[PDB]
Amino acid sequence: DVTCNIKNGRCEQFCKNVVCSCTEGYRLAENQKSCEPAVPFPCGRVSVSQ
Amino acid sequence: VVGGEDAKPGQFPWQVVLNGKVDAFCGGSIVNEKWIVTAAHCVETGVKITVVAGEHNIEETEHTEQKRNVIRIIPHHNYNAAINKYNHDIALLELDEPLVLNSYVTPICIADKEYTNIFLKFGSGYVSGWGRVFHKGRSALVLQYLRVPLVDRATCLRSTKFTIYNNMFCAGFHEGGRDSCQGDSGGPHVTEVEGTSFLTGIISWGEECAMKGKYGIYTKVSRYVNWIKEKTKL
Ligand SMILES: N=C(N)c1ccc2[nH]c(-c3n[nH]c(-c4ccccc4)c3O)nc2c1
Ligand code: NA
């Protein structure tokens, strides 16, 4: 039913056949799919008002 | 960047500018507080370089800038300028003192080899730098950015007499007009993955900037992920 070959197993960042994971500085959300900041300035985010 | 737009402050907080005998000669990206990733052709001569993070307008002090001296230059072990100046075109720079991460100075994410390749294949990245805004013209004061589409290898190979190796990629437009240029090399090519940008390429080289039938050539970062993570470990 759930596989990384279809929509990345619904993982926001990384998928492993599913178990979702995130890059350093991010933590896996309560839904087990989304990624949330785990530090004040995580990589690859714009935090100044645009 | 030819045909780009002025970035707003803190829009590309991973971007850095390199200065040497000529200021703003190349760009780079923050891997972490002590390390920068750039093109090896930018630092091959092993000259005294300074990095400026938190920069927006290179001729106006905005109080977000962080200058650091480079204490170590690590070109990739397969880089050899006497054989090919633009093949294996990637290098790391160690800063004398760590940067203070904030909204204007933030690292770029780097995924594993597999995911960096998947993100490149999404086919649309953002490039940025203070390079030439016209072919053979004046270089930018405000940081420029541009969305560039990925070009298939076959179209890329037909566009040049030069050799495009498999861990290089083409990006740009069929009719030119918009492209990276001299002064941008070493800077980032990033892919937005659900609001998080990942490094997918290094701005490397090209023939005429923004010419119809020619494309910008970039280094595939997926080819060097294990080397970047290893050498930059804090
Ligand atoms: N057509 C393009 N899209 C393009 C992109 C990057 C470039 N980088 C250069 C370049 N030309 N010369 C140097 C250079 C930089 C530092 C030291 C020595 C040469 C460069 O990085 N031309 C370029 C043209
Ligand atoms: Na400034």
Side-chain angles (χ1 to χ4, degrees):
Chain A
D1 191 293
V2 193
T3 182
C4 306
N5 310 142
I6 303 305
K7 303 291 202 166
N8 200 49
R10 304 300 192 169
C11 304
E12 182 188 316
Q13 288 173 13
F14 317 130
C15 185
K16 166 70 173 164
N17 284 320
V18 308
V19 168
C20 297
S21 49
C22 307
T23 195
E24 179 153 20
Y26 292 85
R27 151 192 83 203
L28 200 65
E30 189 169 4
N31 69 357
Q32 315 306 330
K33 305 285 135 187
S34 303
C35 292
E36 289 173 1
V39 298
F41 299 94
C43 68
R45 280 307 190 81
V46 172
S47 51
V48 177
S49 183
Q50 297 289 119
Chain B
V1 175
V2 182
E5 282 174 321
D6 293 1
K8 302 180 190 177
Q11 192 179 344
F12 300 92
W14 43 81
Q15 178 80 235
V16 311
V17 58
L18 270 44
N19 301 316
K21 199 185 168 173
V22 161
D23 287 5
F25 72 96
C26 271
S29 307
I30 296 169
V31 170
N32 62 43
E33 68 191 56
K34 277 282 283 190
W35 291 92
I36 306 303
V37 61
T38 187
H41 80 257
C42 292
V43 300
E44 176 260 353
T45 51
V47 170
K48 198 240 181 219
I49 291 148
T50 74
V51 168
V52 186
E55 189 63 273
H56 177 249
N57 184 325
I58 54 161
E59 276 191 22
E60 301 219 85
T61 293
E62 294 140 311
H63 306 280
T64 58
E65 310 86 354
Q66 287 183 44
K67 186 176 77 47
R68 295 289 187 279
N69 295 343
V70 170
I71 60 165
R72 199 182 176 198
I73 296 168
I74 305 172
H76 190 268
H77 67 96
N78 293 138
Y79 185 74
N80 192 330
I83 293 163
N84 189 321
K85 196 178 149 72
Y86 299 108
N87 194 16
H88 303 109
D89 201 12
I90 193 173
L92 297 165
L93 320 178
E94 186 171 16
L95 307 178
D96 58 335
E97 292 294 359
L99 298 161
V100 177
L101 304 180
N102 60 33
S103 300
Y104 304 93
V105 182
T106 297
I108 189 60
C109 303
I110 308 179
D112 69 11
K113 175 172 177 183
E114 176 178 38
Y115 270 95
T116 303
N117 185 46
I118 289 165
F119 299 155
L120 180 68
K121 291 191 183 160
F122 287 178
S124 181
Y126 285 82
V127 299
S128 52
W130 290 265
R132 294 179 163 171
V133 299
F134 300 105
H135 175 61
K136 296 184 157 190
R138 51 111 173 168
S139 89
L141 297 181
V142 180
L143 178 59
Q144 296 294 110
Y145 78 96
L146 173 71
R147 187 201 69 75
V148 292
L150 183 66
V151 170
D152 47 297
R153 191 172 162 78
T155 296
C156 180
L157 296 191
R158 292 191 294 272
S159 75
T160 187
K161 78 177 180 294
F162 295 109
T163 303
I164 307 307
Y165 293 101
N166 292 294
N167 286 302
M168 285 173 187
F169 71 90
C170 271
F173 297 93
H174 183 286
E175 295 299 273
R178 312 179 194 165
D179 196 6
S180 50
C181 201
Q182 190 187 353
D184 300 322
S185 306
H189 173 278
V190 316
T191 298
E192 302 186 328
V193 179
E194 306 275 27
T196 305
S197 299
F198 285 84
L199 192 67
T200 49
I202 311 302
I203 302 171
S204 180
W205 67 281
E207 296 170 71
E208 300 82 3
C209 298
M211 181 158 120
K212 168 170 160 53
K214 296 285 170 167
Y215 299 99
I217 316 303
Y218 299 78
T219 303
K220 286 192 198 173
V221 163
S222 64
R223 168 62 178 79
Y224 306 96
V225 170
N226 297 322
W227 171 81
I228 300 161
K229 301 288 186 62
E230 167 59 23
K231 300 293 184 173
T232 68
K233 270 163 165 70
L234 305 180

